[PDB]
C-alpha cells in the first residue's frame, strides 16, 4: 500500500484536510491507508471513511447515469449508429465504480466487520456493506445480479436486526440505515410497498422517541426523519 509508510494519525489528519479541500479521492485513499493499519476505527474515523467513499462513488454513479441514459437513447428506433464509444465509455466508468465498491467491501471484510463488537460500529459497517452492494446492484446485469441484490439485502437485514435490539429508534445510524434499506426496497428489489412501510414505521417510531433527546440529538434525528418524509412524499 502506498500509504504504508505514513503514520495512522497523519493519514487521519490528511483525510480531514482533503475533506476541507473537497479532494474526496485523496480523502478515500488516506482513509483506506488508515484502515489498513489494522486498528479499529473510532466514530469520527468511521464517518471520515464513509464520507470519503460516498463522495467518490456518488460522482461515479452520477456519471454512470448520464452515460447510461445516452446509451439507452442510442439504442432506440430512429437513432443513428454512433459506434461502440458510448458503451465503451459507460463500461469504463462502470468498471471504475465497481472497483471502488470492491475496495470498500474489501476493507469491510478485511477486517472491519469482524472486529466490530459494539452495536454502533457493527451496524455502521453493515449499513456500508449493504450500500456498496446496492451500488454494485445498480449497474449489474449478469449471472450474479440476483446474488448481488441478496448480498445487499442480507447486510442491511443483519444491520436492521442489531439496530432494533441495541439502539433507540432515533439513533441517526439506525435512521440512516432504514432510510437506505427503504430505498433498496424501492429502487433495487422492486418492493415499493416494503419501502413505504419501512419508511413510515421508522418515521413514526422515531417521532415517539424524540421527547427523550437533547436539542442537539433532536437536530440530528429530525434531519434524517425529514429525508424519510421526503421519500414518502416522492413515493405516494
Amino acid at each position: 500500500g502506498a500509504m504504508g509508510s505514513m503514520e495512522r494519525a497523519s493519514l487521519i489528519q490528511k483525510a480531514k484536510l482533503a475533506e476541507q479541500a473537497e479532494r474526496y479521492e485523496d480523502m478515500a485513499a488516506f482513509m483506506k491507508g488508515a484502515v489498513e493499519k489494522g486498528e479499529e476505527l473510532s466514530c469520527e474515523e468511521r464517518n471520515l471513511l464513509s464520507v470519503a467513499y460516498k463522495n467518490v462513488v456518488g460522482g461515479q454513479r452520477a456519471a454512470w447515469r448520464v452515460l447510461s441514459s445516452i446509451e439507452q437513447k442510442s439504442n432506440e428506433e430512429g437513432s443513428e449508429e454512433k459506434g461502440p464509444e458510448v458503451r465503451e465509455y459507460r463500461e469504463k466508468v462502470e468498471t471504475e465504480l465497481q472497483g471502488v465498491c470492491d475496495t470498500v467491501l474489501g476493507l469491510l471484510d478485511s477486517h472491519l466487520i469482524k472486529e466490530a463488537g459494539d452495536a454502533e460500529s457493527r451496524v455502521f459497517y453493515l449499513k456500508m456493506k449493504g450500500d456498496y452492494y446496492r451500488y454494485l446492484a445498480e449497474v449489474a446485469t449478469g449471472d450474479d445480479k440476483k446474488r448481488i441484490i441478496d448480498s445487499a439485502r442480507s447486510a442491511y437485514q443483519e444491520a436492521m436486526d442489531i439496530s432494533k435490539k441495541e439502539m433507540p429508534p432515533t439513533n441517526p445510524i439506525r435512521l440512516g440505515l432504514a432510510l437506505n434499506f427503504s430505498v433498496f426496497h424501492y429502487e433495487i428489489a422492486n418492493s415499493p410497498e416494503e419501502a413505504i412501510s419501512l419508511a413510515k414505521t421508522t418515521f413514526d417510531e422515531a417521532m415517539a422517541d424524540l421527547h427523550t433527546l437533547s436539542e442537539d440529538s433532536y437536530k440530528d434525528s429530525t434531519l434524517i426523519m425529514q429525508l424519510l418524509r421526503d421519500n414518502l412524499t416522492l413515493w405516494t
Binding site: 432510510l179 437506505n180 429525508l227 413515493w235
Partner: peptide, 5 residues
C-alpha cells in the same frame, strides 16, 4: 432520485 445518507 430518492434520498440516502
Amino acid at each position: 432520485f430518492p434520498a440516502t445518507v
